[PDB]
Amino acid sequence: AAIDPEEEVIAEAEGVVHLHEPASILVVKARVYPFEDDVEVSTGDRVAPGDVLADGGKVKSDVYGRVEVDLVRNVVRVVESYDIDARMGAEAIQQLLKELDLEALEKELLEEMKHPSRARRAKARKRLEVVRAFLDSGNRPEWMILEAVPVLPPDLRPMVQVDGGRFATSDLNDLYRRLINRNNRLKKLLAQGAPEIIIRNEKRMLQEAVDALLDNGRRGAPVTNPGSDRPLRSLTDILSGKQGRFRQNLLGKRVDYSGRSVI
Amino acid sequence: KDYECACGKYKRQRFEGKVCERCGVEVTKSIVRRYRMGHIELATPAAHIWFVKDVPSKIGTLLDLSATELEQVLYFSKYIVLDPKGAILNGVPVEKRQLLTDEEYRELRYGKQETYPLPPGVDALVKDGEEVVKGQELAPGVVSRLDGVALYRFPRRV
Amino acid sequence: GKAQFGGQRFGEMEVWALEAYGAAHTLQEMLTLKSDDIEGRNAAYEAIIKGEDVPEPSVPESFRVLVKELQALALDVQTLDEKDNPVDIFEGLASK
Amino acid sequence: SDPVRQYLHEIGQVPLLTLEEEVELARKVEEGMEAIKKLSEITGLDPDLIREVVRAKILGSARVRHIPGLKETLDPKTVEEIDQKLKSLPKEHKRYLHIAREGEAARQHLIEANLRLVVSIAKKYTGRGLSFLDLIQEGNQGLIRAVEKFEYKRRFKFSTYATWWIRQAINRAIADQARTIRIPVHMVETINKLSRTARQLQQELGREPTYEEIAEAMGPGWDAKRVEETLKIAQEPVSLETPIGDEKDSFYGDFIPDEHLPSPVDAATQSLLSEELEKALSKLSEREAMVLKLRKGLIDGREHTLEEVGAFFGVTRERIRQIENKALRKLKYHESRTRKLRDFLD
DNA sequence: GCATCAGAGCCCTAAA
DNA sequence: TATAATGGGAGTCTGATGC
RNA sequence: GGGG
Ligand SMILES: [Zn+2]
């Protein structure tokens, strides 16, 4: 078949067809199951040994694999591969954290506390200390993973008009904006069915954006405003340090009814 | 503004707690812009860096994941297996909570294949559809490295 | 600073001095009515111009900021009474 | 450990397409869309719903979510139900299902094989307010657009068509998200135009142009006032955390007073004004003060005029417009003695 | 052993 | 909305504690 | 950058 009616190759009369001089040869590790009648599985389905492929049940699959339905060659290919569940990111970790029975892990770790070499007992304790923290507190470990990210009230990250009619704004607004853009773009990329490379890039960028918002500079390059080297001031920076909330506004304050002069 | 909605239909304290139908804003003290929290609904979950990067990691210690492993899963460098579904890689079965690279995951998940460029005009020593051993010679200069079904890509001459 | 008509900083070490003197009410004034306790600073001024004694202080606004900033970090900070029931220091304003 | 480098390595894991393969995938994508169109007619469904169902099975069970616009929540039950109606077709109809499936699969490869193109375009847009990866992701968004619109029959190579859509996508991104105060895309274009113009004007004149010189250079519609108003609009906010000095102490935000919350003096004054205001309406009479109090409203703001006043004062309606004068008049005489409200005039 | 992290005095002025 | 275009640019010294 |  071709772009325009001419240049098509139409069979002049009865004959048999042979393919020669291919551009390249693709060697696939797969099984070939030819079919005469209609095929019941469509392309992309995943399949296990014994699953019925075509012709009302006559032809079935031997290996584990992914269905490739060839309408030219009239064959159902099954490419050897598994239906394995393997993930990346905070979603994987959130699942493994949900799938924790802390009672059981305590039991196991207590049994591990009954062991020589000193080093084994030391590590089971540290683990057992985190377990017991969650058990006593009532906190679920999967809460260490965020689904909804809180947004600080606006008067604590103000956008104010200064004297000159100019605007002055808190760095948190920019950290949130990066996050929001990336979240929104991620939702859009999902609805439009982007490939896994793209969705993965977006997802890891989302993690970094959350990371800068909560503690900027902790992991990776500090997020900066454009054309300045100044790390944006994240939530962690606000709380901690000499300039932090505690040692600046809490354990000490500026006061009314006070003055100063030379003695 | 204190006790005043956005569009200004309800401007004083006789209404306190009303939510203006036109603009949607509560009539209360403006001080609440210091108090009320919002939220962002993430499409996919994100880890809280304090429980990752504050050593020894709290998430890492609970799950028996090292600093390097937790980095690789959270930052999309390596897969972690929830349900192997009978997978096997390099002869040993994939066990749950095993770390796979991208190549390892693709071989497990999508299967293994390779494409060999036949020098232009040179015709293949094998036919389309034929099962092939590793080492078998496909074309005068092309030798296949793996077993499977050989498939013709683009025949130049029919 | 003088140019902003500023107040003096009563810093960590100044607070220590008041603690070592055991001046609990002077220190509390420094931490509330003379700074960020808004209800307190407003009420204290009104009392002095009326000749009344200054009222007992309320919560410093910068503590409320700390609470809300810890919530932005997804940490739940709760003021509790002796019965371990939550005490609302936002006086209903932040709860739906 | 380096997010750019990681992504560069992952794109390098998809080989670039040969001219044949490029055309093949493109061909399959077009045919698949036509198949979905036909599958809609046959089945009586919605072409988008069918397309998402086809697409769901290709990508696998991993990605399943509600899609904005689809009539049904797209959960495993509905994708199974709808897939079973598609697989219930006769052999000659069911072939279109296979076509659509193969179309979606090919779309995936086509997109994946061109990601390196987006990088080479995005690298040129750095420094305009979006980070490199943000430029790559927006560029990737355009690439997705290009794959859906590409007509392979026109015989142009794919890179040619994509580049338009990718450049378009990045430029919309820079214009849309780069400013803390968001500006309409067309307005950003005018501002950028104004910049270029001044740069020309300054390069020939050897000095900064005035507003008038720019207004001339901009053509009809432009005076100096409009150039000034436009620059005012184009001003980006400054960080409250901008350091004053180089030490880490003192921030710009530390020098900004809070003008919103009333000061102790102001709070006191408002209390005192309200207290003399009621302690003034009752010393004539609470009732003629009651007619008047209804007219302004203490914490109500009950100012209208002649209509509404039809209701509960105690009298009918023109009379209140008189006791209002008599309320204000009696207030006025009593005021010269208790002249304490004079000082609230500031 | 070696790396990674988080510490490193207080108040005040003026300049930005 | 159509020649083709397909992998980035850049910079002190302490003590305590977990691999 | 100065003052104690
Ligand atoms: Zn309103």
Side-chain angles (χ1 to χ4, degrees):
Chain A
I3 309 285
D4 327 300
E6 60 268 2
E7 313 164 335
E8 288 192 47
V9 170
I10 302 182
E12 267 172 77
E14 158 168 347
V16 83
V17 186
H18 302 255
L19 290 165
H20 291 275
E21 292 184 79
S24 51
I25 297 178
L26 161 66
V27 179
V28 183
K29 183 120 181 61
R31 305 292 166 97
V32 292
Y33 303 96
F35 63 94
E36 307 148 325
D37 197 37
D38 182 40
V39 51
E40 300 306 320
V41 296
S42 195
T43 235
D45 285 308
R46 287 194 173 271
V47 128
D51 285 342
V52 288
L53 275 27
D55 298 52
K58 294 210 164 179
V59 43
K60 62 185 57 179
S61 172
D62 300 340
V63 294
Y64 286 108
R66 55 175 350 266
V67 163
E68 218 165 353
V69 166
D70 201 327
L71 286 188
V72 166
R73 297 191 188 84
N74 269 19
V75 64
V76 181
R77 263 184 317 275
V78 165
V79 197
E80 302 182 21
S81 62
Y82 306 98
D83 199 23
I84 176 177
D85 189 288
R87 300 179 165 149
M88 283 181 152
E91 172 186 38
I93 299 306
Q94 185 200 9
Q95 185 73 5
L96 294 177
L97 281 181
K98 279 184 179 176
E99 297 172 355
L100 265 192
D101 185 52
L102 292 168
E103 324 235 54
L105 183 50
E106 193 185 28
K107 294 179 178 301
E108 158 177 2
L109 290 166
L110 288 171
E111 305 266 281
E112 195 129 16
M113 278 298 300
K114 277 127 65 170
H115 188 274
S117 53
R118 222 170 310 184
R120 229 183 216 181
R121 280 179 286 113
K123 306 306 175 176
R125 186 192 67 244
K126 303 168 189 325
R127 284 195 65 186
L128 197 42
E129 287 179 13
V130 189
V131 173
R132 280 212 154 141
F134 276 105
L135 278 170
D136 305 342
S137 68
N139 292 326
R140 288 264 70 221
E142 64 258 31
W143 296 350
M144 294 181 293
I145 313 293
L146 304 172
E147 286 174 9
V149 172
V151 171
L152 181 81
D155 279 11
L156 307 190
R157 31 168 258 267
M159 169 95 52
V160 295
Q161 219 166 357
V162 294
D163 200 30
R166 291 282 306 224
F167 273 91
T169 190
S170 180
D171 284 346
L172 285 185
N173 292 312
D174 279 338
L175 294 159
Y176 279 122
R177 282 197 322 113
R178 288 160 38 83
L179 186 51
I180 308 234
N181 279 324
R182 301 186 170 183
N183 202 46
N184 289 349
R185 190 198 299 135
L186 178 58
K187 282 182 223 200
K188 185 158 178 291
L189 288 170
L190 288 180
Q192 294 186 329
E196 275 297 320
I197 302 192
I198 296 177
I199 296 300
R200 186 194 313 192
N201 201 31
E202 195 61 36
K203 282 177 69 184
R204 124 155 51 83
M205 283 168 4
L206 191 70
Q207 179 62 102
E208 286 205 30
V210 180
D211 283 345
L213 171 69
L214 301 185
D215 199 346
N216 184 25
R218 187 63 217 76
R219 182 205 116 94
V223 168
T224 74
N225 261 333
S228 178
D229 294 335
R230 185 184 70 79
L232 295 189
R233 194 152 193 257
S234 58
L235 292 174
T236 292
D237 299 336
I238 293 173
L239 281 197
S240 53
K242 206 146 55 158
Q243 307 297 313
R245 192 65 74 213
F246 282 118
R247 292 173 68 178
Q248 204 64 63
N249 321 104
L250 256 324
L251 295 175
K253 302 174 155 76
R254 288 199 184 279
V255 288
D256 284 336
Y257 302 117
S258 68
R260 138 177 307 257
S261 192
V262 166
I263 63 176
Chain B
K1 304 217 119 206
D2 294 353
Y3 303 105
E4 169 175 350
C5 71
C7 64
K9 183 172 182 190
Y10 306 84
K11 278 173 194 255
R12 251 170 190 284
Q13 190 178 351
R14 44 182 301 234
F15 299 96
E16 194 209 296
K18 179 57 166 112
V19 188
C20 180
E21 315 86 27
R22 193 177 308 286
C23 68
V25 188
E26 179 178 352
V27 277
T28 23
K29 305 148 192 190
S30 57
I31 195 76
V32 306
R33 304 192 99 241
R34 316 183 49 91
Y35 302 148
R36 307 187 171 185
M37 307 270 297
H39 84 281
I40 298 171
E41 201 68 54
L42 294 180
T44 88
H48 191 307
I49 188 160
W50 280 11
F51 306 110
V52 173
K53 237 49 178 41
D54 168 75
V55 178
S57 171
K58 303 300 180 179
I59 292 168
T61 61
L62 278 188
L63 295 175
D64 193 23
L65 291 165
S66 70
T68 299
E69 298 167 351
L70 193 50
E71 161 82 12
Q72 284 166 350
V73 180
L74 281 176
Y75 292 92
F76 297 89
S77 186
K78 273 217 221 276
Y79 294 78
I80 193 105
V81 295
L82 288 76
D83 186 19
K85 280 287 183 49
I88 146 175
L89 164 112
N90 303 328
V92 293
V94 165
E95 199 76 337
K96 190 184 174 187
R97 284 145 161 271
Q98 188 182 334
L99 302 182
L100 313 170
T101 66
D102 235 271
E103 305 80 346
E104 299 177 358
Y105 177 76
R106 276 199 304 259
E107 175 170 350
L108 267 20
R109 177 80 178 165
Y110 304 110
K112 65 190 309 178
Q113 69 181 63
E114 199 149 301
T115 290
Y116 307 84
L118 259 53
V122 180
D123 204 21
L125 308 192
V126 322
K127 221 79 193 177
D128 165 89
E130 80 182 50
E131 229 73 25
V132 168
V133 73
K134 176 181 181 179
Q136 182 169 346
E137 232 249 18
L138 276 21
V142 173
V143 157
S144 179
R145 288 248 226 85
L146 73 153
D147 312 347
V149 177
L151 271 172
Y152 281 357
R153 290 310 288 127
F154 302 95
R156 306 262 170 74
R157 166 175 61 99
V158 171
Chain C
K2 190 203 172 195
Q4 295 70 244
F5 209 69
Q8 297 298 310
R9 169 151 185 89
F10 205 77
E12 289 189 64
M13 312 179 75
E14 287 67 33
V15 172
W16 298 343
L18 290 199
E19 291 169 341
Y21 273 135
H25 285 80
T26 303
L27 177 57
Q28 190 177 31
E29 280 188 358
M30 242 59 51
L31 303 175
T32 56
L33 306 182
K34 275 178 266 175
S35 222
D36 47 6
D37 169 355
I38 310 175
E39 172 192 323
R41 69 184 186 215
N42 291 347
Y45 184 93
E46 190 163 343
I48 297 174
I49 64 177
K50 281 183 165 185
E52 302 160 52
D53 209 10
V54 312
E56 232 189 56
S58 99
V59 182
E61 195 60 20
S62 282
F63 183 59
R64 296 201 183 113
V65 169
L66 172 77
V67 167
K68 287 302 164 172
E69 272 160 338
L70 285 159
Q71 285 187 355
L73 278 159
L75 300 183
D76 184 29
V77 162
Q78 275 278 21
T79 58
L80 297 173
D81 58 40
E82 69 287 344
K83 295 162 162 187
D84 289 72
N85 299 320
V87 182
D88 184 352
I89 67 179
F90 301 92
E91 298 176 353
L93 271 40
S95 48
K96 303 173 297 193
Chain D
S1 171
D2 179 16
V4 167
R5 172 167 281 183
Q6 203 170 188
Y7 180 88
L8 297 177
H9 174 88
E10 290 172 8
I11 79 187
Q13 298 309 78
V14 186
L16 292 148
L17 304 184
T18 306
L19 174 54
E20 285 135 326
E21 353 183 48
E22 177 182 305
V23 175
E24 186 200 333
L25 296 179
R27 182 181 56 252
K28 293 183 182 188
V29 172
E30 201 167 289
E31 287 172 9
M33 295 179 52
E34 294 176 3
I36 291 169
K37 287 176 189 170
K38 295 210 97 170
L39 285 175
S40 159
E41 305 174 324
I42 293 171
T43 59
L45 302 178
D46 168 88
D48 317 1
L49 171 56
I50 297 175
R51 191 194 60 234
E52 294 309 340
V53 173
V54 175
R55 186 178 290 161
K57 278 298 193 227
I58 277 295
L59 292 182
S61 54
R63 191 173 327 168
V64 49
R65 56 160 291 179
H66 179 71
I67 307 296
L70 270 52
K71 302 177 304 177
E72 307 258 16
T73 305
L74 213 70
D75 52 75
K77 197 183 316 299
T78 303
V79 314
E80 268 320 294
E81 294 188 16
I82 275 355
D83 200 37
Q84 282 340 298
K85 272 153 167 171
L86 283 169
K87 292 176 178 183
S88 292
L89 282 194
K91 181 169 166 295
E92 65 279 359
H93 284 354
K94 195 174 184 170
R95 62 177 308 242
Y96 289 14
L97 176 70
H98 297 274
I99 306 295
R101 290 281 193 102
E102 173 89 348
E104 283 307 314
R107 170 175 184 282
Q108 299 293 313
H109 196 356
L110 190 55
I111 299 184
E112 294 188 285
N114 285 273
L115 300 168
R116 309 188 214 203
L117 189 64
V118 172
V119 175
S120 287
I121 304 186
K123 71 180 307 180
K124 296 183 305 189
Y125 291 76
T126 58
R128 328 256 245 89
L130 287 199
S131 68
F132 189 24
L133 286 30
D134 284 57
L135 298 164
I136 285 170
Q137 290 293 116
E138 304 281 351
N140 291 339
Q141 230 160 9
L143 168 62
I144 290 174
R145 299 267 49 75
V147 171
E148 313 217 0
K149 299 281 210 310
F150 190 58
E151 288 171 354
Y152 82 107
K153 304 212 190 154
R154 299 173 182 235
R155 310 180 115 96
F156 302 116
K157 271 189 99 169
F158 182 68
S159 67
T160 293
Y161 191 51
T163 288
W164 189 91
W165 281 102
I166 298 168
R167 287 195 207 285
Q168 199 77 31
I170 291 185
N171 276 305
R172 180 220 68 90
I174 297 175
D176 201 18
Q177 7 163 316
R179 293 173 160 264
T180 289
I181 315 294
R182 181 185 164 277
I183 287 296
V185 48
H186 57 91
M187 190 60 54
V188 166
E189 286 181 7
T190 289
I191 292 170
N192 291 334
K193 183 181 181 189
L194 197 70
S195 290
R196 270 180 276 112
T197 321
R199 222 199 71 182
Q200 285 284 4
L201 284 171
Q202 163 207 304
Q203 216 194 16
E204 47 169 88
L205 294 167
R207 56 144 172 87
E208 285 300 84
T210 63
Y211 293 152
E212 288 79 11
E213 299 171 80
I214 303 167
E216 201 174 348
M218 292 266 308
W222 288 92
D223 56 354
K225 170 179 51 150
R226 192 183 171 183
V227 179
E228 182 177 5
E229 282 162 18
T230 297
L231 291 182
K232 181 57 184 302
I233 301 172
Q235 277 175 2
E236 298 202 63
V238 56
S239 179
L240 283 177
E241 287 86 20
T242 295
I244 302 304
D246 301 331
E247 273 172 7
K248 281 174 189 171
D249 39 68
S250 65
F251 295 153
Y252 177 113
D254 289 343
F255 302 86
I256 302 171
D258 179 42
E259 280 286 31
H260 184 60
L261 256 161
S263 76
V265 177
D266 291 342
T269 317
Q270 225 267 356
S271 270
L272 300 181
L273 173 68
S274 294
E275 183 165 4
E276 222 178 338
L277 275 185
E278 190 60 20
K279 282 191 192 306
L281 285 178
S282 63
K283 305 317 202 266
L284 304 188
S285 80
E286 198 44 274
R287 275 217 181 169
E288 71 189 21
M290 250 271 310
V291 159
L292 188 43
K293 199 180 184 186
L294 279 172
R295 287 253 348 128
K296 295 273 165 69
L298 165 48
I299 340 186
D300 291 305
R302 184 174 181 90
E303 314 177 61
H304 325 272
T305 292
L306 285 165
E307 300 88 26
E308 293 179 21
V309 186
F312 180 77
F313 284 70
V315 308
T316 286
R317 80 166 305 278
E318 272 318 323
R319 185 87 220 284
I320 291 299
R321 298 186 39 192
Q322 251 187 345
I323 64 195
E324 174 205 44
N325 290 305
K326 164 204 185 297
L328 264 75
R329 287 209 190 76
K330 278 178 187 266
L331 272 187
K332 293 181 190 192
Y333 178 71
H334 292 266
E335 171 53 39
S336 286
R337 174 183 102 277
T338 312
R339 44 146 313 280
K340 239 163 193 198
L341 276 52
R342 176 286 169 272
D343 319 295
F344 298 114
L345 264 174
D346 275 330

